UniProtKB/Swiss-Prot annotation, chain A:
Record-given protein name: Tyrosine-protein phosphatase non-receptor type 18
Main location: nucleus
Residue span, Tyrosine-protein phosphatase domain: 16-280
Catalysed conversion reaction: O-phospho-L-tyrosyl-[protein] + H2O = L-tyrosyl-[protein] + phosphate
Binding of substrate, residues: D187, S219, S220, A221, G222, C223, G224, R225, Q265
Enzyme Commission code(s) on record: 3.1.3.48
Function per UniProt: Differentially dephosphorylate autophosphorylated tyrosine kinases which are known to be overexpressed in tumor tissues.
The keyword Phosphoprotein belongs to this UniProt entry's keyword annotation: yes
Molecular function in Gene Ontology: non-membrane spanning protein tyrosine phosphatase activity; protein tyrosine phosphatase activity
GO cellular component: cytoplasm; cytosol; nucleoplasm; nucleus
Keyword Cytoplasm attached: yes
Active site location: S219 (phosphocysteine intermediate)
Name of the encoding gene: PTPN18
Keywords annotated in UniProt: Cytoplasm, Hydrolase, Nucleus, Phosphoprotein, Protein phosphatase
From Swiss-Prot, chain B:
Source taxon at top rank: Eukaryota
Tissue occurrence: Expressed in a variety of tumor tissues including primary breast tumors and tumors from small bowel, esophagus, kidney and mouth.
Protein's job: Protein tyrosine kinase that is part of several cell surface receptor complexes, but that apparently needs a coreceptor for ligand binding. Essential component of a neuregulin-receptor complex, although neuregulins do not interact with it alone. GP30 is a potential ligand for this receptor. Regulates outgrowth and stabilization of peripheral microtubules (MTs). Upon ERBB2 activation, the MEMO1-RHOA-DIAPH1 signaling pathway elicits the phosphorylation and thus the inhibition of GSK3B at cell membrane.
Annotated family: Belongs to the protein kinase superfamily. Tyr protein kinase family. EGF receptor subfamily.
Disease implication from the record: Glioma: Gliomas are benign or malignant central nervous system neoplasms derived from glial cells. They comprise astrocytomas and glioblastoma multiforme that are derived from astrocytes, oligodendrogliomas derived from oligodendrocytes and ependymomas derived from ependymocytes. Ovarian cancer: The term ovarian cancer defines malignancies originating from ovarian tissue. Although many histologic types of ovarian tumors have been described, epithelial ovarian carcinoma is the most common form. Ovarian cancers are often asymptomatic and the recognized signs and symptoms, even of late-stage disease, are vague. Consequently, most patients are diagnosed with advanced disease.
Subcellular locations according to the entry: Cell membrane; Cell projection, Ruffle membrane
Chain positions with Phosphotyrosine modification: Y4
Protein name, entry field: Receptor tyrosine-protein kinase erbB-2
Entry comment on modification after translation: Autophosphorylated. Autophosphorylation occurs in trans, i.e. one subunit of the dimeric receptor phosphorylates tyrosine residues on the other subunit. Ligand-binding increases phosphorylation on tyrosine residues. Dephosphorylated by PTPN12.
């Protein structure tokens, strides 16, 4: 019924451009009202840790790193928690690590028991370095600080997605971490295969199994492509789990944008979210 | 190569 009525409301009614422009107004207001601030991200000791000057994590929901803290390590990383459907910390949306934030990225993974990492960008995008390789090659393990990262096996989930089985070691404890990377999803755009994107989410959920640990989700800035993944996964859970009878995609995206800046970056990605959700409900 | 979005 609830999924059904959602499509009815869609059919009763392609703008949408109006709705997303209203999402932008709400964002600008949260910043005017100081309900979303970027104080920790602007600190002079943290600025170099931001990939982009215009993308800072909100103080209210930022990931706070306490691991190695006794050693004098900063609590800071450009990343935010996003709440899941049950109200728990389901996602961590973070930027593509820089050469000097690789260690912080692994502190994050380690401290929060992360099992699955979703990557929605490439290392090199427009002739530009967009993300550092943080995973291991079969042929070179990766070392930052006290962590040793090791590639066990690689395969393709499908033509667009690489599934890497990683081992990470820290102080004699060992954990498996899975990374799924989506290869052909540009910036401000949409993936080449909405179906493959769904499969990525499907596989991430299988690998995640039970357990309260959040999915780690990133792209280059940790905004547009990251926010689309989180939103897709969030709405899938709603369905598998609980779709409200007044269910609104406008409210979901608003909620996301309140936790991670510009989560869902462009009108095009917003329309894409609608097409995807609509398809998902038909089945 | 400095700025992403807004």
């Amino acid at each position: 019924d609830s999924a059904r009525s959602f499509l009815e409301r869609l059919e009763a009614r392609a703008v949408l451009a109006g709705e997303f422009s209203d999402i932008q107004a709400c964002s600008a207001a949260w910043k005017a009202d100081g309900v979303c601030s970027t104080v920790a991200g602007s600190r002079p000791e943290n600025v170099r840790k931001n990939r982009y000057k215009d993308v800072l994590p909100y103080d209210q929901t930022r990931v706070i790193l306490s691991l190695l803290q006794e050693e004098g390590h900063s609590d800071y990383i450009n990343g935010n928690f996003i709440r899941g459907v049950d109200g728990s910390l389901a996602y961590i949306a973070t930027q593509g690590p820089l050469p000097h934030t690789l260690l912080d990225f692994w502190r994050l993974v380690w401290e929060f028991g992360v099992k699955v990492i979703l990557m929605a960008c490439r290392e090199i995008e427009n002739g530009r370095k967009r993300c550092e390789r943080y995973w291991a090659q079969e042929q070179e393990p990766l070392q930052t600080g006290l962590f040793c990262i090791t590639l066990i096996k690689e395969k393709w989930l499908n033509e667009d997605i690489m599934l890497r089985t990683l081992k990470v070691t820290f102080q004699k404890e060992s954990r498996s971490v899975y990374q799924l990377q989506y290869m052909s999803w540009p910036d401000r755009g949409v993936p080449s295969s909405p179906d493959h994107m769904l499969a990525m989410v499907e596989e991430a959920r299988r690998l995640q199994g039970s357990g309260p640990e959040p999915l780690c989700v990133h792209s280059s800035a940790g905004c547009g492509r990251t926010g689309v993944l989180c939103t897709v996964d969030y709405v899938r859970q709603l369905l598998l789990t609980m779709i409200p009878p007044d269910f609104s995609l406008f409210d979901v995206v608003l909620k996301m944008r309140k936790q991670r800046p510009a989560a869902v970056q462009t009108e095009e990605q917003y329309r894409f979210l609608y097409h995807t959700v609509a398809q998902m409900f038909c089945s | 190569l400095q700025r992403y979005s807004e």
